[PDB]
Amino acid sequence: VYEAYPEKKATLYFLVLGFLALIVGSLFGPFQALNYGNVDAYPLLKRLLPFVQSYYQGLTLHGVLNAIVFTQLFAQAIMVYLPARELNMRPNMGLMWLSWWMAFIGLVVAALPLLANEATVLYTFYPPLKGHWAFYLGASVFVLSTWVSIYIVLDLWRRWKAANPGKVTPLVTYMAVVFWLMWFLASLGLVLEAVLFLLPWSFGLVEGVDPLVARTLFWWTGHPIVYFWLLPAYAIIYTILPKQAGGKLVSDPMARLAFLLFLLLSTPVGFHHQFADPGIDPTWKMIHSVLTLFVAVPSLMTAFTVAASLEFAGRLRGGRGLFGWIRALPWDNPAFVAPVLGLLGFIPGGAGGIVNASFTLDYVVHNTAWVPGHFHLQVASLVTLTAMGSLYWLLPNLTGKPISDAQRRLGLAVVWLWFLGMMIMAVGLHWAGLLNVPRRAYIAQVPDAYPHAAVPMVFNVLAGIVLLVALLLFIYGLFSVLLSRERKPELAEAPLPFAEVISGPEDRRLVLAMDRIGFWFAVAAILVVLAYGPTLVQLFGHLNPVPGWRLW
Amino acid sequence: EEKPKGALAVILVLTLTILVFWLGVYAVFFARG
Amino acid sequence: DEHKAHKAILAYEKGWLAFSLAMLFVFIALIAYTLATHTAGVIPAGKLERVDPTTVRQEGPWADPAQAVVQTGPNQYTVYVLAFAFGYQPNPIEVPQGAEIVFKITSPDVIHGFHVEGTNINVEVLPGEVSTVRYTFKRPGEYRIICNQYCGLGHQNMFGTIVVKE
Numbered sequence: 001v002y003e004a005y006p007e008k009k010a011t012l013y014f015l016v017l018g019f020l021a022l023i024v025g026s027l028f029g030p031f032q033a034l035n036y037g038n039v040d041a042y043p044l045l046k047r048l049l050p051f052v053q054s055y056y057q058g059l060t061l062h063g064v065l066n067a068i069v070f071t072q073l074f075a076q077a078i079m080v081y082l083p084a085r086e087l088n089m090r091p092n093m094g095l096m097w098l099s100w101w102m103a104f105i106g107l108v109v110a111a112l113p114l115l116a117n118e119a120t121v122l123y124t125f126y127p128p129l130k131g132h133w134a135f136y137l138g139a140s141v142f143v144l145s146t147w148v149s150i151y152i153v154l155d156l157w158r159r160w161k162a163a164n165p166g167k168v169t170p171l172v173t174y175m176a177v178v179f180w181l182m183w184f185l186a187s188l189g190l191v192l193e194a195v196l197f198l199l200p201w202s203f204g205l206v207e208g209v210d211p212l213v214a215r216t217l218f219w220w221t222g223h224p225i226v227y228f229w230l231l232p233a234y235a236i237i238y239t240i241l242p243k244q245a246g247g248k249l250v251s252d253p254m255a256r257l258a259f260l261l262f263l264l265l266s267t268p269v270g271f272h273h274q275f276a277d278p279g280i281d282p283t284w285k286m287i288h289s290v291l292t293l294f295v296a297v298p299s300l301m302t303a304f305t306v307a308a309s310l311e312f313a314g315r316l317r318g319g320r321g322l323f324g325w326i327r328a329l330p331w332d333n334p335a336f337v338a339p340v341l342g343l344l345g346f347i348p349g350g351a352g353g354i355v356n357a358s359f360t361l362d363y364v365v366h367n368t369a370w371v372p373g374h375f376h377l378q379v380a381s382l383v384t385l386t387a388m389g390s391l392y393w394l395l396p397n398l399t400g401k402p403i404s405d406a407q408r409r410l411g412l413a414v415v416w417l418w419f420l421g422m423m424i425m426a427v428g429l430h431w432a433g434l435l436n437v438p439r440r441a442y443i444a445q446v447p448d449a450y451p452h453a454a455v456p457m458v459f460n461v462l463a464g465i466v467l468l469v470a471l472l473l474f475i476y477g478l479f480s481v482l483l484s485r486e487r488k489p490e491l492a493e494a495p496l497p498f499a500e501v502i503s504g505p506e507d508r509r510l511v512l513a514m515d516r517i518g519f520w521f522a523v524a525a526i527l528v529v530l531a532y533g534p535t536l537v538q539l540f541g542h543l544n545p546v547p548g549w550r551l552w
Numbered sequence: 553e554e555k556p557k558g559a560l561a562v563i564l565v566l567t568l569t570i571l572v573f574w575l576g577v578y579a580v581f582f583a584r585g
Numbered sequence: 586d587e588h589k590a591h592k593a594i595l596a597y598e599k600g601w602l603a604f605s606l607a608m609l610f611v612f613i614a615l616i617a618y619t620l621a622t623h624t625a626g627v628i629p630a631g632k633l634e635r636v637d638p639t640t641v642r643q644e645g646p647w648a649d650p651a652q653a654v655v656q657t658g659p660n661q662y663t664v665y666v667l668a669f670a671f672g673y674q675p676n677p678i679e680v681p682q683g684a685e686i687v688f689k690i691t692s693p694d695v696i697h698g699f700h701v702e703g704t705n706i707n708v709e710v711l712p713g714e715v716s717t718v719r720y721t722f723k724r725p726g727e728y729r730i731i732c733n734q735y736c737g738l739g740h741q742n743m744f745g746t747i748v749v750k751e
């Protein structure tokens with residue numbers, strides 16, 4: 001297990017590191033949900049943890065830990081370990097263990113300041129909000145790690161391409177390749193935003209940073225970063241769920257095309273986060289809008305490919321008429337159950353995002369509690385649930401520890417609660433957003449400030465209780481899996497459960513074209529030079545740096 | 553065997569849910585106009 | 586079977602595609618609809634219009650708050666607003682009804698939000714830059730301004746007031 005696949009170990013450390021992160025970050029959730037239901041439990045939390053000074057220090061850890069530390073680590077686990085196991089190759093271990101220590105040292109470096117109240121700036125850290133230099137230095141190093149993650153997978157692909165000239169990229173690899181490439185293009189904004197401004201700014205080397213340029217450059221990454229969260233799930237959903245589900249991936253090509261399209265349209269769409277900004281041309285915003293409705297196509301595609309697969313998996317295990325196939329599925333199965341539930345809520349999640357996309361409509365919901373509503377369905381439901389369920393096949397595979405009857409049932413427990421709780425919370429937040437309730441606010445410290453929002457508050461609070469149990473149950477579940485001296489090697493070498501693929505004759509021509517990865521990559525690059533170049537050049541001509549503020 | 557009526561339901565629940573959300577807001581949009 | 590089922594999958598994969606595209610295009614047609622009417626005002630101006638955050642409230646159109654409102658057109662009034670750590674100026678903002686109001690907003694500290702409850706006005710305010718938005722108030726009375734971009738510990742507590750005179 002460890003010594004002809006030590007990748008299993010390096011992979012396992014990305015998980016623990018990540019799951020300890022999701023646990024710590026998550027603690028603040030239940031609180032913030034009640035906070036949105038008009039209850040102040042923060043003296044209660046302040047008495048659990050002496051170091052918390054404000055709602056906002058807590059929302060910062062929560063944003064950062066969960067959405068930045070958890071998700072990247074999961075990404076690293078999945079989008080490196082999966083391709084390696086399909087190809088039956090080892091990554092450069094020297095390089096792989098460098099990526100780990102960089103994600104650990106960046107994490108640590110950043111935390112010290114975060115936990116000391118020197119970076120209460122949210123996971124977006126918009127200037128002139130000026131946090132401690134080690135939080136910028138820490139996050140940068142934390143991100144940069146992913147650059148080794150790109151390289152490593154590119155290497156494995158160079159290696160397999162060579163042993164096999166002419167041959168088509170295997171599916172998971174194909175996916176991991178466009179994924180890491182797309183993520184390299186993404187990360188250019190944030191790195192430039194770090195290298196050119198943030199880092200000098202807090203190092204004392206300049207007294208000021210441009211708010212518009214800073215956010216424009218940040219949103220170059222902060223959109224594709226969410227796809228950088230999703231694909232590792234889509235990867236699993238496409239090539240492993242359908243096995244767990246009792247059937248097959250119905251289309252190899254469609255899954256590549258899906259991901260291709262992500263490589264193309266994930267990065268040039270950032271002014272969707274800036275509809276509400278000055279100094280960016282109305283023409284460009286609409287352009288960025290059309291392209292955003294475009295990046296929604298892959299997922300619309302994904303809905304169909306995936307649905308079919310489950311219908312056929314449920315057909316295979318004797319599923320009946322219009323809906324019969326749904327019952328026939330293995331509902332006893334945490335690995336099956338967790339992302340299928342996530343996928344139900346991904347429906348609404350998406351249908352929100354598209355409202356969000358459509359320029360003029362974004363002035364109804366922008367910075368309300370509706371964006372939270374939205375993204376929780378997305379990253380704290382689907383990505384996280386896919387993550388959660390996946391321990392039930394991935395963790396046995398890493399360590400060789402099997403899952404008992406009860407730990408499974410404890411998991412089923414967690415996932416049905418998490419999902420329901422996430423559903424519920426989405427009603428509240430969406431509802432609250434339409435009633436103009438802003439986000440990122442300590443609203444329970446102004447009790448008579450949203451009196452027309454009485455009801456959705458109930459839901460928030462209710463989701464807060466449910467999801468507190470959800471998380472506690474999970475922490476217990478997780479650690480029982482991790483701290484049992486229960487071990488067998490034979491199922492730890494037992495292969496990952498990859499699905500077989502349905503593949504037609506027409507594939508050939510289509511799949512060969514999508515393999516022209518250098519070309520597709522070049523286009524993606526051009527798409528970003530076209531979509532951001534004009535606007536960036538403008539800004540870089542008329543730079544108005546303003547001093548930093550500390551307001552916590 | 554035959555036509556993926558299950559998938560065709562799902563893409564139909566998706567389609568119904570996109571419209572509700574979108575038109576639901578477009579309506580609100582003009583109302584706050 | 587099996588191959589028999591890949592064909593008919595792919596067709597409807599194309600078909601679902603066809604549909605979703607049209608549907609997505611109609612959205613695009615309805616959006617550039619809103620863009621051709623009056624409601625398009627709430628879109629910030631694109632033109633860069635730079636100011637200095639450390640002087641904005643001692644010299645120029647944001648220093649005296651009683652200067653805020655100016656007849657700038659035959660039915661057009663410009664209102665210079667300052668969003669700042671935990672409030673708005675003037676407080677309240679007083680604007681006449683039915684008139685086109687051209688809000689010019691900025692900040693002397695960090696980013697704030699300018700979200701006028703009841704309306705489509707929802708513009709980010711940025712130190713160093715000027716958010717130009719326009720809007721015609723149709724129903725009179727008090728409107729409440731909400732800062733919806735975290736600004737520091739007093740964020741939750743940063744409200745203003747628009748007063749639209751009949």
Ligand code: HAS
Binds near residue numbers: 272293296374378379
């Ligand atoms: C990881 C999580 C992320 C995903 C994924 C995501 C999806 C989208 N979003 Fe979003 N979003 C926006 C647009 C979209 C669009 C167009 C999509 C699309 O990618 C959506 C594609 C999804 C679909 C088209 C639905 C497909 C459904 C499927 C695949 C499930 C079907 C289920 C089946 C088949 C199972 C059935 C099985 C059975 C057994 C029944 C916009 C604007 O365009 C804003 C700015 C709003 C503002 O003012 O800030 C925004 C705001 C956010 C923020 C806030 C950032 C901040 O703090 O400021 C985050 C974190 C976020 C994350 C995510 N978002 N989003």
Ligand code: HEM
Binds near residue numbers: 031
């Ligand atoms: C225990 C379940 C969770 C609960 C009850 C919860 C609660 C909340 C609430 C109520 C908000 C809105 C707070 C506000 O706007 O002031 C929020 C924000 C947020 N949540 Fe969660 N959360 C949970 C788990 C997660 C997870 C696992 C992730 C990431 C994968 C996540 C990602 C985020 C992000 C990115 C924000 C935005 C914070 C910001 O604006 O800086 N949440 N959370």
Ligand code: CUA
Binds near residue numbers: 696697732733736740
């Ligand atoms: Cu100013 Cu929130």
